[PDB]
């Protein structure tokens, strides 16, 4: 990301790989992520993942 000002991006760029494990247990990309905003109040891709998915590892924090 590049900043327009404190609060707004001059440019969101956001890219990478969406992956599947095959019955062989081999893995491939089946979709690319290819997002741009210029300005925005967020990043819909990342916003979406936090709302719909999870990290591959998480801390089991003690009480």
């Amino acid at each position: 990301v590049h900043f327009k000002n404190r609060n707004v991006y001059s440019h969101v760029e956001t890219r990478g790989q969406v992956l599947v494990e095959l019955p062989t247990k081999e893995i491939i990309q089946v979709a690319t992520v290819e997002y741009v905003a210029g300005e925005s109040h967020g990043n819909p891709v990342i916003d979406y993942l936090q709302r719909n998915g999870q990290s591959i590892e998480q801390p089991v924090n003690f009480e």
Binding site: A37, H41, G42, P44, D47
Partner: protein
């Protein structure tokens, strides 16, 4: 998604303001008949009588 990209503050511009109907009491005295449509066709016979 449309909320998120624009952020929240913008939405006030589309959540349109609507008019509350404040009452309107009136001292409606009877509607004066039109001279031409109402009075005149009767006037020829009733004037001065």
């Amino acid at each position: 998604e449309n909320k998120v990209v624009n952020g929240e503050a913008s939405e006030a511009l589309y959540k349109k303001k609507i008019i509350e109907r404040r009452a309107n009491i009136k001292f409606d005295f009877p509607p004066l008949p039109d001279w031409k449509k109402d009075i005149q066709p009767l006037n020829d016979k009733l004037k001065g009588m």
